[PDB]
Amino acid sequence: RKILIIEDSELQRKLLSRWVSKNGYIAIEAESISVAREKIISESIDVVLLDWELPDGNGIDLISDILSTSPVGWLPIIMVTGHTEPEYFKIAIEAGATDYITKPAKEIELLARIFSALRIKALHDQLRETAIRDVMTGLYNRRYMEERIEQEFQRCKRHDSLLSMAMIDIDKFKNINDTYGHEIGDQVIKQLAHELKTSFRKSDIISRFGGEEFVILFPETGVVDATRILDRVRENVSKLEMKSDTDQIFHFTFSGGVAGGDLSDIQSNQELLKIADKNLYEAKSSGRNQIIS
Amino acid sequence: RKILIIEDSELQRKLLSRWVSKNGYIAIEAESISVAREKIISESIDVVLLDWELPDGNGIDLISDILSTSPVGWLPIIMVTGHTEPEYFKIAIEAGATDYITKPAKEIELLARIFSALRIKALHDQLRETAIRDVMTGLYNRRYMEERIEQEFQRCKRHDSLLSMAMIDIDKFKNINDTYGHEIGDQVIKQLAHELKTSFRKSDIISRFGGEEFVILFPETGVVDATRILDRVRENVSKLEMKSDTDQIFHFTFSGGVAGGDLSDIQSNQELLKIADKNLYEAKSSGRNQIIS
Ligand SMILES: Nc1nc2c(ncn2[C@@H]2O[C@@H]3COP(=O)(O)O[C@H]4[C@@H](O)[C@H](n5cnc6c(=O)[nH]c(N)nc65)O[C@@H]4COP(=O)(O)O[C@H]3[C@H]2O)c(=O)[nH]1
Ligand SMILES: Nc1nc2c(ncn2[C@@H]2O[C@@H]3COP(=O)(O)O[C@H]4[C@@H](O)[C@H](n5cnc6c(=O)[nH]c(N)nc65)O[C@@H]4COP(=O)(O)O[C@H]3[C@H]2O)c(=O)[nH]1
Ligand SMILES: Nc1nc2c(ncn2[C@@H]2O[C@@H]3COP(=O)(O)O[C@H]4[C@@H](O)[C@H](n5cnc6c(=O)[nH]c(N)nc65)O[C@@H]4COP(=O)(O)O[C@H]3[C@H]2O)c(=O)[nH]1
Ligand SMILES: Nc1nc2c(ncn2[C@@H]2O[C@@H]3COP(=O)(O)O[C@H]4[C@@H](O)[C@H](n5cnc6c(=O)[nH]c(N)nc65)O[C@@H]4COP(=O)(O)O[C@H]3[C@H]2O)c(=O)[nH]1
Ligand SMILES: [Mg+2]
Ligand SMILES: [Mg+2]
């Protein structure tokens, strides 16, 4: 629906700007990269037109500077460039552009690339607004568990059952990743998920919930038993010997809030979440490797 | 990893064929469109290069002739054309091409489009290799529901709960489809799913299970109650006025087996299925529009 144009030159920028808004689209102008970021966060930006040559960085650090800025952490970025060279295309795609236009842009080759992007965007939008299984961990994703909670809660609240929910978080993940590699970052998330899978009952509802976030539902289980068993894992994880990108041993831990059990005084399913969260906050806020309830 | 090239001319085709397999890829040659289809079905084809000008059709019927042929019903198709004209791009994208390449093809602008496609393919592949709801109906899919049943069963068997499972089937679907169109076929499946969604509890686990198959789980529900409510729907569906091909009113019905309730005598979760099926058999075998248990 909504396109953001980055171009240092006012005339080149306002030409694109018209081609866009002529075809029922919403033009959004950016002087250079400062302004562009204040829009990406500020508004619901579908597609990005990026002059390779901006008043700060040359294209190929400039690309991933918009990727990082995005809410979902990916926008479709069309290169509007005067670069021509074969290997400038293959650099731009390599660096995570969605498309490449060689200036001068023709109106009806552009509109076709904007369509081609809006297509490949709705794909990213599904994968992140629906119940998929996360390939990496083998656990379901988060909008799964959002749905699954409200089911499992409504069931347990109608049929006077115990329902206890955990909310887990890997301790200083940003750091593990930044220090050992996006590779080892991933390698840990896996090894944690593996412990979670092995530790409980097929009846229990494990799920990845965010970057390093996880969520467990323990139907028919009370807050203390939930804590007891979750804590027992937290320990075994603590004691787990991982290898660094040097083949150095290192350990990692998670913080946990658990919440629910009874449910008489919990009305919303969204309240049962608020609690698990407040409790994960304290868990971290108090030196991390520990469960709170 | 595996690219299929359609070009009438042997020399143009085997030039592309080398550019491809030079970059660690798998070239697959097609004389014209007959041969190409015998490959799409025959093998795991990632990406398609399509000469616009082939010995039978002009590009724009030729495109959707490959779309239909695909197992998943969509491949990324890159247009190799000598057409230049603005509105030939805008036709090709409109008609469901993934990209447009202007002959003569340059090695290193091609390889960039093939990469751009393999990316937008792996996105389609995620959404369909992990992704638990059926698109069409918005219900849980089958691979999920097989897993979900064994969970919900193991839960109910551990915690002495009632668990009743339905298995539904639209009556003489083949006929509805053959008479009114693959269009109206689809349109009914939807309308049934919608009734199923509206009729029960958030707690209940509805799922599309095959062409015209559906499955419901009624946790905490006994075989009779399951039957009563499932039968109440079967009725309202019966009374539903659908519109044909022609805007003719027509009605449709479903057959149902329900099974479980107690679970003391049922060991496998796969047995709880066998029963629902045997009962759907009788339901149909005895003049269809009816539940059996
Ligand atoms: N969601 C969930 N809750 C868990 C899990 N492990 C323990 N709990 C909770 O903790 C309680 C006590 O566990 P326990 O003392 O070993 O008490 C258990 C234990 O001795 C045994 N038990 C139950 N299920 C199993 C099982 O699958 N394997 C084994 N080896 N023993 C089991 O029977 C006792 C019955 O206690 P319960 O009524 O199950 O009550 C359980 C349950 O409320 C788990 O993996 N998932
Ligand atoms: N300490 C403790 N551990 C628990 C408890 N619940 C589950 N676990 C652990 O989690 C594993 C998975 O149990 P499950 O998936 O419910 O599936 C279980 C369950 O369906 C059945 N089973 C085993 N022991 C019991 C039991 O005491 N009661 C019941 N009702 N089923 C059991 O056998 C399966 C595998 O048994 P395990 O090899 O023992 O494997 C169990 C056990 O190692 C619990 O309450 N306490
Ligand atoms: N999974 C599932 N099971 C179902 C459903 N409808 C009925 N049952 C089962 O069959 C019984 C029939 O409920 P009812 O005769 O409609 O009589 C119901 C009805 O008058 C009322 N009631 C129950 N659930 C609801 C509800 O969700 N909404 C409203 N408005 N009333 C409800 O309270 C009575 C108590 O019924 P129960 O003790 O629950 O016992 C229910 C339960 O055993 C359903 O849609 N899904
Ligand atoms: N006769 C009958 N109809 C059923 C039954 N189960 C589901 N339905 C129908 O489908 C809806 C199911 O609501 P829910 O998801 O169970 O979730 C329930 C629950 O959260 C609450 N609710 C409504 N009635 C009851 C009830 O009797 N007991 C409890 N515990 N909650 C109820 O409101 C929701 C549905 O409110 P409704 O407007 O009535 O909407 C109900 C109702 O018209 C059933 O057993 N019997
Ligand atoms: Mg400029
Ligand atoms: Mg030719």
Author numbering:
A (entry chain A), B (entry chain B): 6 to 298
What does the original paper state about this entry?
C-di-GMP is a near-ubiquitous bacterial second messenger responsible for the coordination of a variety of cellular processes and behaviour, including motility, biofilm formation, virulence and cell cycle progression.
Hereby, dimeric c-di-GMP mutually cross-links a RxxD motif (primary I-site, Ip) on one GGDEF domain with a secondary I-site (Is) on the other GGDEF domain and vice-versa. The crystal structure of DgcR obtained in presence of c-di-GMP (DgcR_inh) was determined to 3.3 Å by molecular replacement and is shown in Fig. 8a. There are three symmetric dimers in the asymmetric unit. Dimeric c-di-GMP is cross-linking the domains by interacting with the R206xxD209 motif of one subunit and R163* from α0’ of the other subunit. Owing to symmetry, there are two isologous cross-links within the DGC dimer. The DgcR equivalent (R237) is too distant to interact, but this may happen with the Rec stalk in the activated conformation. Indeed, it has been noted earlier that among GGDEF sequences arginines are enriched at either position.
